């Protein structure tokens, strides 16, 4: 049974949009059995607490669903795929938990997830347990601008710096933009004190 009860993830997420609930996390923690599982309890929690405050930031504490900046939607249809955007140029926009963006991660989370993402990318925004699941994927098997898995970066004691790098890195990791950076670490501080677990070593980047 997961190392954040119901309590804890509403004191995490006081603000959250009715669109993501207790219930559909912890259904979707089947997907990746690993998750919050590996390690002692102290590691289990700072990794569920390393999940939900990137998660925090990425959506303003589960406020939103789908990405706020209309403008740049038409900007994560990355045309040199040879599976291209069938859903739309503008359709690749981040969704949900993790804010799952761009055709070629949709694709791929569609395949890891046998769930047809690419052709209907609207589900994350829809379905709750899909959502979820898009952001579970990307935690445990992405790489993104840094160079392991958010999951094992907590898991090897890399440090939560390095989740930082591998969920946005390139731009906001060496200055990058270091105000963003902060905003993960205070979330991270915060609800590792409401799990009652460490932060652990090399929270930055």
Same mark, same amino acid.
């Given at each position: 049974g997961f190392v954040v009860?119901?309590? +804890?993830?509403? +004191?995490?997420f006081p603000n959250r949009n009715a669109f993501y609930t207790y219930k559909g996390l912890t259904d979707a923690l089947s997907a990746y059995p690993a998750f919050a599982k590996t390690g002692s309890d102290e590691v289990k929690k700072r990794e569920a607490a390393?999940? *939900?405050?990137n998660v925090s930031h990425e959506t303003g504490g589960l406020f939103y669903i789908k990405e706020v900046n209309e403008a740049?939607?038409?900007?994560?249809?990355?045309t040199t795929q040879s599976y291209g955007c069938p859903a739309g140029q503008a359709a690749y926009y981040g969704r949900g938990p993790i804010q799952l963006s761009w055709n070629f991660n949709y694709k791929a989370a569609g395949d890891a997830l046998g769930i047809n993402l690419l052709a209907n990318p609207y589900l994350v925004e829809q379905d709750?347990?899909?959502?979820?699941?898009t952001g579970l994927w990307?935690?445990?098997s992405q790489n993104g601008p840094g160079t392991m898995?958010?999951?094992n970066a907590i898991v090897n004691n890399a440090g939560f710096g390095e989740t930082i790098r591998s969920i946005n890195?390139? *731009?906001e990791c060496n200055g990058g933009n270091p105000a963003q950076v902060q905003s993960r670490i205070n979330k991270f501080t915060q609800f590792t004190q409401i799990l009652?677990?460490?932060?652990?070593?090399? *929270?930055?980047?």
């Open positions: 009860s119901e309590a +804890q993830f509403n +004191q995490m390393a999940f *939900l405050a740049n939607y038409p900007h994560y249809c990355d709750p347990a899909v959502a979820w699941k990307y935690w445990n898995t958010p999951h890195g390139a *731009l009652g677990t460490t932060t652990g070593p090399n *929270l930055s980047c």
